[PDB]
Each structure stands twice: as C-alpha cells, then as structure tokens.
Design an enzyme around this catalytic site. Structure first.
Site, PDB file in Angstrom:
ATOM      1  N   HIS A  31      -0.896   4.506  -0.719  1.00 23.04           N
ATOM      2  CA  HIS A  31      -2.152   5.437  -0.580  1.00 23.04           C
ATOM      3  C   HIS A  31      -1.913   6.879  -0.433  1.00 23.04           C
ATOM      4  O   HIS A  31      -2.032   7.548   0.470  1.00 23.04           O
ATOM      5  CB  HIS A  31      -2.521   5.028   1.028  1.00 23.04           C
ATOM      6  CG  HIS A  31      -3.570   3.813   1.302  1.00 23.04           C
ATOM      7  ND1 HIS A  31      -4.566   3.884   0.566  1.00 23.04           N
ATOM      8  CD2 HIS A  31      -3.229   2.717   1.851  1.00 23.04           C
ATOM      9  CE1 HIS A  31      -5.164   2.667   0.799  1.00 23.04           C
ATOM     10  NE2 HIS A  31      -4.423   1.909   1.586  1.00 23.04           N
ATOM     11  N   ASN A  34      -8.012  -3.107  -3.351  1.00 19.31           N
ATOM     12  CA  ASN A  34      -9.451  -2.757  -3.307  1.00 19.31           C
ATOM     13  C   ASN A  34      -9.716  -1.213  -3.286  1.00 19.31           C
ATOM     14  O   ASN A  34     -10.876  -0.748  -3.438  1.00 19.31           O
ATOM     15  CB  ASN A  34     -10.115  -3.250  -1.852  1.00 19.31           C
ATOM     16  CG  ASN A  34      -9.218  -2.608  -0.511  1.00 19.31           C
ATOM     17  OD1 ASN A  34      -7.951  -2.627  -0.500  1.00 19.31           O
ATOM     18  ND2 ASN A  34      -9.919  -2.148   0.176  1.00 19.31           N
ATOM     19  N   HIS A  35      -8.674  -0.308  -3.272  1.00 16.84           N
ATOM     20  CA  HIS A  35      -8.792   1.100  -3.415  1.00 16.84           C
ATOM     21  C   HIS A  35      -8.771   1.570  -4.743  1.00 16.84           C
ATOM     22  O   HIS A  35      -8.937   2.781  -4.968  1.00 16.84           O
ATOM     23  CB  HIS A  35      -8.021   2.064  -2.538  1.00 16.84           C
ATOM     24  CG  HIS A  35      -8.474   2.018  -0.964  1.00 16.84           C
ATOM     25  ND1 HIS A  35      -9.244   3.003  -0.487  1.00 16.84           N
ATOM     26  CD2 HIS A  35      -8.415   1.112   0.019  1.00 16.84           C
ATOM     27  CE1 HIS A  35      -9.618   2.773   0.764  1.00 16.84           C
ATOM     28  NE2 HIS A  35      -8.900   1.862   1.068  1.00 16.84           N
ATOM     29  N   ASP A  85       0.891  -1.031   0.117  1.00 18.56           N
ATOM     30  CA  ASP A  85       0.001  -0.100  -0.090  1.00 18.56           C
ATOM     31  C   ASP A  85       0.925   1.272   0.127  1.00 18.56           C
ATOM     32  O   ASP A  85       1.656   1.236   0.976  1.00 18.56           O
ATOM     33  CB  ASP A  85      -0.854   0.240   1.324  1.00 18.56           C
ATOM     34  CG  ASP A  85      -1.763  -1.221   1.265  1.00 18.56           C
ATOM     35  OD1 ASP A  85      -1.500  -2.472   1.002  1.00 18.56           O
ATOM     36  OD2 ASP A  85      -3.146  -0.986   2.057  1.00 18.56           O
ATOM     37  N   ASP A 131      -3.551  -0.148  -3.967  1.00 22.80           N
ATOM     38  CA  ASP A 131      -3.797   0.701  -2.928  1.00 22.80           C
ATOM     39  C   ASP A 131      -2.762   1.914  -3.288  1.00 22.80           C
ATOM     40  O   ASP A 131      -2.315   2.132  -2.291  1.00 22.80           O
ATOM     41  CB  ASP A 131      -3.836   0.084  -1.618  1.00 22.80           C
ATOM     42  CG  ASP A 131      -5.240  -0.374  -1.287  1.00 22.80           C
ATOM     43  OD1 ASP A 131      -6.019  -0.731  -2.083  1.00 22.80           O
ATOM     44  OD2 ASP A 131      -5.551  -0.485   0.099  1.00 22.80           O
ATOM     45  N   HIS A 167      -3.141  -8.258  -4.082  1.00 22.65           N
ATOM     46  CA  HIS A 167      -3.319  -7.401  -2.996  1.00 22.65           C
ATOM     47  C   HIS A 167      -3.871  -7.730  -1.620  1.00 22.65           C
ATOM     48  O   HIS A 167      -3.366  -7.588  -0.537  1.00 22.65           O
ATOM     49  CB  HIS A 167      -4.221  -6.179  -3.244  1.00 22.65           C
ATOM     50  CG  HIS A 167      -4.487  -5.000  -2.377  1.00 22.65           C
ATOM     51  ND1 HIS A 167      -3.620  -4.183  -2.094  1.00 22.65           N
ATOM     52  CD2 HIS A 167      -5.511  -4.843  -1.408  1.00 22.65           C
ATOM     53  CE1 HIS A 167      -3.977  -3.355  -1.056  1.00 22.65           C
ATOM     54  NE2 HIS A 167      -5.197  -3.660  -0.567  1.00 22.65           N
ATOM     55  N   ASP A 208      -6.299   6.983  -2.393  1.00 19.18           N
ATOM     56  CA  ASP A 208      -7.067   7.135  -1.193  1.00 19.18           C
ATOM     57  C   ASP A 208      -6.071   7.276   0.258  1.00 19.18           C
ATOM     58  O   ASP A 208      -5.138   7.069   0.266  1.00 19.18           O
ATOM     59  CB  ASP A 208      -8.105   5.726  -0.936  1.00 19.18           C
ATOM     60  CG  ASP A 208      -9.344   6.178  -1.743  1.00 19.18           C
ATOM     61  OD1 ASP A 208      -9.766   7.062  -2.152  1.00 19.18           O
ATOM     62  OD2 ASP A 208      -9.797   4.850  -2.072  1.00 19.18           O
ATOM     63  N   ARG A 209      -6.754   8.176   0.973  1.00 19.88           N
ATOM     64  CA  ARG A 209      -6.348   8.240   2.384  1.00 19.88           C
ATOM     65  C   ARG A 209      -5.203   9.506   2.525  1.00 19.88           C
ATOM     66  O   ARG A 209      -5.498  10.492   2.981  1.00 19.88           O
ATOM     67  CB  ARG A 209      -5.855   7.160   2.992  1.00 19.88           C
ATOM     68  CG  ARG A 209      -7.037   6.337   3.245  1.00 19.88           C
ATOM     69  CD  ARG A 209      -6.219   5.179   4.100  1.00 19.88           C
ATOM     70  NE  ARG A 209      -7.542   3.912   4.330  1.00 19.88           N
ATOM     71  CZ  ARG A 209      -8.501   4.376   5.135  1.00 19.88           C
ATOM     72  NH1 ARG A 209      -8.516   5.384   5.673  1.00 19.88           N
ATOM     73  NH2 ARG A 209      -9.320   3.099   5.316  1.00 19.88           N
ATOM     74  N   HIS A 232      -2.639  -4.467   2.042  1.00 15.47           N
ATOM     75  CA  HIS A 232      -3.978  -4.487   2.387  1.00 15.47           C
ATOM     76  C   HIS A 232      -4.358  -4.204   3.969  1.00 15.47           C
ATOM     77  O   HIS A 232      -5.366  -3.808   4.319  1.00 15.47           O
ATOM     78  CB  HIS A 232      -4.515  -5.737   2.051  1.00 15.47           C
ATOM     79  CG  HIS A 232      -6.042  -5.879   2.379  1.00 15.47           C
ATOM     80  ND1 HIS A 232      -7.096  -4.654   1.839  1.00 15.47           N
ATOM     81  CD2 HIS A 232      -7.001  -6.757   2.676  1.00 15.47           C
ATOM     82  CE1 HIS A 232      -8.167  -4.867   1.907  1.00 15.47           C
ATOM     83  NE2 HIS A 232      -8.294  -6.067   2.406  1.00 15.47           N
ATOM     84  N   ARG A 236     -14.436  -6.573   7.544  1.00 12.75           N
ATOM     85  CA  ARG A 236     -14.451  -5.668   6.559  1.00 12.75           C
ATOM     86  C   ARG A 236     -16.040  -5.547   5.708  1.00 12.75           C
ATOM     87  O   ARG A 236     -16.194  -4.548   5.147  1.00 12.75           O
ATOM     88  CB  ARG A 236     -13.545  -5.786   5.430  1.00 12.75           C
ATOM     89  CG  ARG A 236     -12.180  -5.414   6.070  1.00 12.75           C
ATOM     90  CD  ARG A 236     -11.076  -5.582   4.994  1.00 12.75           C
ATOM     91  NE  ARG A 236      -9.871  -5.627   5.321  1.00 12.75           N
ATOM     92  CZ  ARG A 236      -9.008  -4.509   5.601  1.00 12.75           C
ATOM     93  NH1 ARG A 236      -9.317  -3.217   5.298  1.00 12.75           N
ATOM     94  NH2 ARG A 236      -7.702  -4.823   6.076  1.00 12.75           N
TER      95      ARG A 236
HETATM   96 MN   LIG Z   1      -6.488  -2.653   0.616  1.00 17.64          MN
HETATM   97 MN   LIG Z   2      -4.645  -0.153   1.943  1.00 10.24          MN
END
Ligand SMILES: [Mn+2]
Ligand SMILES: [Mn+2]
Length: 326
Positions: free
Chosen positions: A70, A129-130, A68, A97, A178, A100-101, A253, A226
């Site tokens: 991010h 997943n992002h 990740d 990923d 991921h 995001d964030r 993840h 989740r």
């Molecule tokens: Mn993830």
């Molecule tokens: Mn993540």
C-alpha cells in the site's frame, strides 16, 4: 534538464534499479518517458502469463511471499534491506495491494515493475483488489498519479494492472491469492486458470472472490461487510483444499497487529507487509519464507522505518466496496 535514472538502451538493469531506488528514497521523480517505457514493457511480460501462475520450487530453493504494501515505499526498501534484493537466487511474490492509502504508491509500483522486468522468472506480482480503477479513484493512487504525471499516465497504469495474474500455486501444494476463497462450493484450480482476467473485476463470481473475500472463524459463509463476496469458514477451506489436492492457502488483504495470522487450523494463512499501516495502526508486518523441501511457512516480522513528512491519503455511504478503515 533531467539528471535522474535512465534505461540502459531500452533495457532495465541492476544499476538502473539501484539508481532508481536511491532517486525515490530522495523523493525525486522518474522521467515520464522512462515511466512509460517500463509500463509498456511490463504489459508485454504480464500479458503472456497465465491467470494462475504455476511455479516449481526445487528442494534447496526458497521464495519470499509478501502481502499488502500500500504505497509504503520506505518499508518496501526496508524489506529489501532485511531480506536481500530480488534475484535469480532470491525470488519474491508480492500478493497484491501495492498501491492506495500510502503516499509513495508511484514509487512502490515502478520499483516493483522494474524488478519484474529485470527478473521475470523470479519476481512475481499478483493483483489485489486495489489494483483496480474502482479503489484507485477513492483511495489515493489515481490522485497520486495525476499530481506526479498525467491522467494519461494513469490510464496506462490501469491497463497494466488488468494483466496481473490472480493466483499462484507452488508445487501443486500452496495456493496464494490476494483475497481468498469462493462464495460457492466446487471451484477448481482449472476454473481459476480459465478466468479471463484483463478487465475490471465484477460484482460477483470467482474473480471477485479471489480479490475480495475474507476468512471467518465459524463454519459457513456470511455476507461480507465489504459489500461484495463473502466471509468463508474453516469448512469452506477444507473442502476447497481437498478437492484441489492442496496443503494450505496464503492470503493478504487484512491488517494484522502481529503482521500475520494462521486461521482454520493452519489451512488459511494471512501475511500483511505494511507495518504501522496508514501511519495509524501501530501493527507489525511480516513476510514469509517457503522452502522447496519444506513448504511450511516461516514468518519474519518487522516494524516501520522513518519516511518523509507526507501524510497518508494525501492524494485522495455512497461509495461501495470498502477496504476497512485507516
Ligand atoms: Mn485487499
Ligand atoms: Mn489492502
């Protein structure tokens, strides 16, 4: 009028990329035409890839695997400082990923797409997943792209994410995805390869598992906190590896204080490349070296570096499917 980086005759080059990283480091914006040219070109490259990327690593070759990132663009720069820029002799896999964030998501993803174009055989990007509309509406990316460009630029990002491969297998021995493994026994590598991936991921099934599941220490499968997919035990991993003749899997993840974690007796490795995650967690990050002669993971840890005063989620019970908080 625009004084920033320009493509060299519709082509991405090493001087364009170096120019681009400087330009972003100083918080400026790639011109939307150039953003547009990069997106449509990586779409053409990614669409021609298999859902399962299969790569052979010669004896003397290595590859670097990251987790990740991010939108932590200044940490991405630090990775390239620490471990060298990407090239034919310095290949990279980013395990999802990228967005995001963090508040430099656009900077991260255009930088990663530009290297994908420059070195398409040595620079690999797996969907997380992002890299989906679901998460981007919630966790900042859609917002960031709307502030910096248009809703139409964003829809083009969404289209490109749908072509990201789901997994990569190295030398028929290490599987990188991921999220993780599956909510039912008996999934094969050929099953993965046949997933039709250019879509938003569903509620349930293999595509969902690959992007969303997590390991747990006790045997069995548990319903995930989740809201989709499951937690899988050591028994799930052993059976998967044995049916598919693999040594182990690498996944991302999940934030880890040490930057990585090795679970299931060695069989399930987590690597996480976003240090001091969300300017909150205080965690280390790591990236992995793999050698063609020796596919055992070497872990290289690192800590966060400074970035501009721009708080995380800046551009962001009843929402469903959650990353954990942050
Ligand atoms: Mn993830
Ligand atoms: Mn993540």
């Amino acid at each position: 009028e625009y004084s920033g980086p320009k493509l060299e005759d519709g082509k991405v080059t090493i001087s364009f990329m170096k120019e681009l990283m400087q330009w972003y480091k100083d918080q400026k914006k790639l011109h939307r035409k150039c953003a547009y040219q990069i997106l449509v070109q990586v779409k053409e490259v990614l669409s021609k890839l298999s859902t399962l990327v299969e790569t052979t690593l010669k004896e003397t070759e290595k590859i670097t695997v990251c987790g990740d990132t991010h939108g932590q663009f200044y940490d991405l720069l630090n990775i390239f400082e620490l471990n060298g820029l990407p090239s034919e002799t310095n290949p990279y896999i980013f395990n999802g990923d990228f967005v995001d964030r963090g508040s430099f998501s656009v900077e991260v993803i255009l930088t990663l797409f530009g290297f994908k174009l420059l070195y398409p055989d040595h620079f690999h990007l797996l969907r997380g997943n992002h890299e989906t509309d679901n998460m981007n509406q919630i966790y900042g990316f859609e917002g960031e792209v709307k502030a910096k460009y248009t809703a139409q630029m964003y829809e083009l990002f969404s289209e490109v994410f749908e072509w990201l491969p789901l997994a990569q297998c190295i030398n028929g021995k290490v599987l990188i995805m991921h999220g993780g493994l599956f909510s039912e026994d008996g999934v094969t590598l050929d099953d993965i390869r046949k997933i039709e991936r250019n879509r938003q991921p569903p509620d349930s099934g293999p595509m969902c598992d690959l992007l969303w599941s997590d390991p747990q220490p006790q045997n069995g499968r548990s319903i995930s906190k989740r809201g989709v997919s499951c937690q899988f035990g050591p028994d799930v991993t052993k059976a998967f590896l044995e049916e598919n003749n693999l040594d182990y899997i690498i996944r991302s993840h999940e934030v880890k204080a040490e930057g990585y974690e090795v679970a299931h007796g060695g069989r399930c490795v987590t690597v996480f490349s976003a240090p001091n995650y969300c300017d909150q967690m205080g965690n280390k990050a790591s990236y992995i070296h793999l050698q063609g002669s020796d596919l055992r993971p070497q872990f290289h840890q690192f800590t966060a570096v400074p970035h501009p005063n721009v708080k995380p989620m800046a551009y962001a019970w009843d929402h469903i499917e959650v990353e954990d908080d942050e």
